């Protein structure tokens, strides 16, 4: 900022004016704008050099919003650490960024990238038989590290329980800890002989995502983020196959554990001799020299009370050293107790796979020092164009609340407030009409409802099935399998159990009469349930995602806050004030005033 | 709209004033150019013929297909008194106005013009450096004040008073400030030529006793003058009005000699793009506008966030649209501004969507949409929020001794269009405050 005349309207911009820097002569070619103060990056995807720019920016930046034309990126310390990790240096990053920038990079930005691009590889952590040695080839630097009281060629054994403490501490200190494991060199750990089946073929983006993890030829821990239905299961299977070591899979739910077992079997050469599932249904353990063990977070994470039969298997899990560990649905690892899974199980390489890297609290960033940096990410819109994930036309139906119903809403307390608008008679009519209309088109409809009471009430009235916690595992699986392969049972209701980590290609439409409090994770996960429809490549096909809300209620506030993640990724919500053809429906629930009054009394009697 | 708006103003002029106006050939040439193309054909034929021509022959001149155009042409000519009809011997003859005919003929050929077009001094001035810069600065300053954005320079008192009296850009003393109304935003949307006449027409209406004919002659003459080529300084009323135009930037004076401005030439007639912007489904806005005015106008209904030399980026928020609607701008104008300044990429993408939709089902045709549907819907919904609750001022009438009297009062109020609510069961009805006096008078009688 020198020899620059402030603009007359510069007051409109609160010190964010960047007119002092002059536009480059070749600005018509460069696709990037760099904001000095905020560090934001504006990228034009319709200009030359778009494709490789997007790949480069994603590597060095964490995407914020990616609409059709203008992509908004941001640079953070964690993003820079991930970039330098995958075979990159400050010299290359600076040259590329300056080359692609429509305007010269400010000195403030240059300092930010420079600082965090030099600490890559000073401190290393390795795992011997069952003892963790935080060693390094050089001897002088570690001596400085050891002097610190927080931690407690040089190699020293560190307490297994306190491993997380040092990992965070290394992040706090200038030098962050690196997680690399040369699976080719070490053969002491028994090797599992497995390879992808000849029929199987890796998709382009799946190949690229796995390439980043193995860019240097050695496996490195990290998190791979792909849209729901992208195929993270196959990415994990391929990652396990290439390492050729023992692999342990931790999964959110037992139903998904079965999916991993089947998916693993369908897409690799492994035989049942080397597969064992440590789930509630059965505690079978593999006796082979090495193999795959798939379990769930609750079983491994549990500390106080675990049965002796489960204890023996858990001791078996903790006994042998493992080569690979897949943390499926890694968005719940930062939970209070699930963090112990990483520490208890000793694995050289840990890979996290999730579709929605979102968490209400500030614990999402902790993943960078529990598993590894965010290695790769994919655009939801980009995959939709390629035909890998079915297109969805999201909508947010506005259901007005009737006067009799609304008056009781105001007087009631907050906790009782939820049940008034969830059981809105107008909302009930909207749900019935949408289901009837979309059932005519031969479309499978899944109706999520977090409120169990409302879920059951809607299901009983509509004569349709439902799944939630009380339902046993056998019944839940039977409904899932039946709904997939039976014409009569075209629609099934669900609850919070089915929100995340379930595969069902048949589902194409989707509704939510009720939902949990404002939380972007559940919205994205529920939307992803219908993003893998098998009939996604058919010409002129569009899946549907309906969100029923009550006007003037707190649900409107939550719904707007509950779809922020989808808006950032690219999805757009359309407001449907009027549903055409609803009046002509011969039968509508709670049409008569007496029925509405009876329902109001019934719902009020709940509390 | 100039081809029609200016015509309407001229028609409202009294016939005697119009006859006086036709004295100057320069004004006649301008009035010649504003008439319909068919009117030009007939007028030119009659200029060189000093004889009466029957209306039937003029009808025969036109083909059967273009009968409607002929009807419009004759009506327009009659409205401005250009054609004077005469009925005699059962024949309806039509002749051109002698004052208009003589003046128009003098303009075409070499003849006395009483220096209507002015006199050349052979002192040219570079236009790209001074006249263009002077014109832009004056128009830039006045527009900035209209938009409301702060600016150190203030428009002259005379122009400020005109805007205060003018409907657009309403100013409220109680608020102590000046604000843009619906008309003001419409003026901004209108092109430069429309904007210039918009101010000029208001000035013509405001002026009372500076003769109106003298002002009109100068304005029409100003169009004839070409950029540069100063002309010697013409009535006294013209001189003072010339100074007023100088404050508007239409004319540049070195202190002696006035150089016609580029805006004057634009005043005669008509004649990635700058100002275009991209609107995403995320509600972000990126405008490739380097002009200071474009940023200021966008800031009226957009929450600006940052700016580069090349472009300015912002985002539509509930605060921005709410602020604009409270000022007086309608949601229809907001969408219109966004669509007209759509980036070429948005237009290309919209065309691709239309082509795909037509391919899927060419039976149904829908209009091409440049902006995303969601952004338009949200802006419209935000406007509906302001009108969520409607309040009327009036009085309630009830406690009627007989139902017949209540029915008669309710019927009378509805007839004069002042009844807001009624209920026969309660024998009550609420009327607007405007009609309260009329209803009370009817009740008394």
């Amino acid at each position: 900022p020198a020899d620059f005349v402030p603009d007359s309207v510069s007051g409109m911009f609160r010190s964010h004016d960047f007119s002092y820097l002059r536009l480059r002569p070749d600005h018509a070619s460069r696709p990037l704008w760099i904001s000095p103060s905020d560090g934001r990056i504006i990228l034009e995807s319709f200009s030359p050099l778009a494709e490789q720019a997007q790949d480069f920016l994603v590597t060095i930046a964490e995407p914020i919003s990616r609409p059709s034309h203008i992509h908004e990126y941001k640079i953070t310390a964690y993003s820079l650490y991930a970039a330098v990790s995958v075979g990159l240096e400050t010299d290359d990053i600076i040259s590329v960024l300056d080359r692609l920038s429509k305007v010269p990079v400010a000195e403030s930005i240059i300092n930010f990238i420079k600082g965090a691009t030099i600490s890559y590889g000073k401190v290393k952590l390795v795992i011997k038989h069952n003892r963790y040695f935080v060693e390094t080839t050089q001897a002088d630097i570690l001596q400085m590290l050891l002097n610190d009281s927080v931690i407690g060629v040089h190699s020293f054994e560190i307490a297994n329980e306190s491993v997380e403490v040092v990992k965070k501490r290394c992040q706090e200190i200038d030098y962050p800890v690196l997680e690399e494991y040369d699976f080719r060199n070490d053969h002491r750990n028994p090797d599992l002989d497995i390879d992808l089946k000849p029929s199987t073929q890796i998709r382009p983006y799946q190949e690229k995502s796995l390439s980043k993890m193995f860019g240097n030829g050695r496996a490195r821990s990290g998190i791979i983020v792909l849209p729901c239905g992208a195929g993270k299961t196959l990415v994990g299977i391929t990652a396990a196959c290439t390492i050729k070591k023992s692999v342990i899979v931790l999964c959110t739910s037992s139903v998904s554990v079965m999916q991993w077992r089947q998916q693993f079997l369908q897409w690799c050469t492994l035989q049942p001799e080397n597969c064992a599932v440590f789930t509630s249904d059965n505690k079978e353990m593999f006796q082979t020299e090495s193999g795959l063990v798939v379990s769930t977070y609750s079983m491994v994470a549990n500390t106080r009370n675990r049965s002796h039969d489960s204890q023996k298997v858990m001791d078996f899990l903790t006994g042998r050293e493992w080569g690979f560990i897949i943390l499926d649905e890694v968005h719940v690892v930062p939970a209070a107790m699930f963090r112990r899974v990483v520490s208890t199980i000793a694995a050289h390489a840990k890979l996290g796979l999730t579709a929605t890297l979102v968490r209400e609290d500030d614990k999402i960033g902790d993943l960078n020092f529990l598993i590894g940096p965010k290695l790769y990410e994919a655009n939801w819109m980009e995959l939709s164009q390629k035909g890998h994930i079915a297109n969805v036309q999201c909508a947010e139906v506005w259901c007005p609340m009737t006067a009799e119903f609304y008056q009781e809403y105001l007087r009631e307390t907050a906790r009782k407030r939820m049940l008034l608008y969830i059981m809105n008679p107008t909302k009930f009519q909207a749900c019935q009409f949408l289901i009837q209309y979309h059932e005519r088109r031969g479309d499978k409809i899944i109706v999520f409802s977090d409120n169990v009471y409302a879920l059951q009430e809607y299901a009983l009235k509509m004569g349709k099935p439902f799944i939630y916690g009380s339902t046993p595992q056998q019944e839940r699986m039977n409904i899932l399998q039946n709904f997939q392969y039976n014409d009569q049972i075209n629609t099934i209701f669900l609850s919070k159990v089915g929100d995340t980590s379930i595969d069902l290609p048949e589902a194409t439409c989707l509704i939510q009469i009720s939902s949990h409090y404002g939380s972007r994770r559940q919205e994205a996960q529920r939307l992803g349930r219908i993003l893998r429809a098998k009939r996604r490549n058919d010409e002129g096909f569009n899946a549907f995602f309906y969100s029923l809300v009550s006007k003037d209620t707190q649900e409107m506030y939550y719904s707007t806050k509950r779809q922020a993640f989808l808006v950032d990724q690219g999805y757009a919500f359309k407001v449907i004030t009027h549903l055409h053809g609803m009046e002509n429906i011969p039968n509508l629930a709670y049409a008569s005033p007496r029925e509405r009054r009876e329902l109001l009394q019934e719902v009020l009697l709940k509390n | 709209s100039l081809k029609h708006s200016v015509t309407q103003y001229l028609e409202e002029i009294p016939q005697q004033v119009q006859n006086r106006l036709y004295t100057s050939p320069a004004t006649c040439l301008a009035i010649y150019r504003i008439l319909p193309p068919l009117a030009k054909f007939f007028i030119m034929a009659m200029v060189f013929n000093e004889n009466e021509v029957p209306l039937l022959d003029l009808d025969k001149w036109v083909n059967s297909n273009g009968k409607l155009q002929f009807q419009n042409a004759i009506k327009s000519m009659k409205s401005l008194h250009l054609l004077i009809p005469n009925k005699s011997s059962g024949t309806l003859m039509i002749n051109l106005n002698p004052t208009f005919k003589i003046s128009l003929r003098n303009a075409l050929t070499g003849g006395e013009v009483q220096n209507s077009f002015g006199v050349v001094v052979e002192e040219n001035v570079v236009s790209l450096d001074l006249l263009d810069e002077y014109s832009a600065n004056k128009w830039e300053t006045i527009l900035h004040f209209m938009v409301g954005t702060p600016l150190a320079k203030i428009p002259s008192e005379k122009v400020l008073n005109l805007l205060k009296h003018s409907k657009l850009m309403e100013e409220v003393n109680s608020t102590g400030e000046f604000k843009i109304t619906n008309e003001g935003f419409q003026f901004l949307l209108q092109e430069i030529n429309s904007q210039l006449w918009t101010l000029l027409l208001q000035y013509l209406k405001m002026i009372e006793t500076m003769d109106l004919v003298d002002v009109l002659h100068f304005i029409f003459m100003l169009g004839a003058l070409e950029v540069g080529k100063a002309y010697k300084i013409l009535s006294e009323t013209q001189r003072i009005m010339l100074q007023d135009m100088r404050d508007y930037g239409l004319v540049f004076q070195k202190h002696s000699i006035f150089y016609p401005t580029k805006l004057a030439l634009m005043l005669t007639s008509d004649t990635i793009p700058d100002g275009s912007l991209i609107v995403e489904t995320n509600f972000k806005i990126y405008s490739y506008s380097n002009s200071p005015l474009q940023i200021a106008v966008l800031s009226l209904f957009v929450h600006l966030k940052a700016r580069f030399v090349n472009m300015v980026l912002g985002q539509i928020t509930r605060e921005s649209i709410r602020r604009a609607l409270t000022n007086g701008i309608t949601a229809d104008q907001i969408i219109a501004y966004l669509e007209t300044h759509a980036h070429p990429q948005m237009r290309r993408l919209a065309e691709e969507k239309l082509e795909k939709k037509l391919e899927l089902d060419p039976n149904c045709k829908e209009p091409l949409q440049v902006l995303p549907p969601t952004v338009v819907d949200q802006i419209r919904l935000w406007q509906l929020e302001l009108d969520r609750v409607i309040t009327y001022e009036g009085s309630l009438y009830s406690d009627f001794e007989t139902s017949q009297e209540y029915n008669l009062l309710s019927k009378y109020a509805q007839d004069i269009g002042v009844l807001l609510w009624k209920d026969d069961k309660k024998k009550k009805f609420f009327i607007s405050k405007e009609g309260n006096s009329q209803v009370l008078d009817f009740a008394k009688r």
Binding site: C399, Q429, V575, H578, L579, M582 | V376, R380
Partner: peptide, 9 residues
Amino acid sequence: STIGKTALG
């Protein structure tokens, strides 16, 4: 875009 149509009910 359905905005001005009567609300469902």
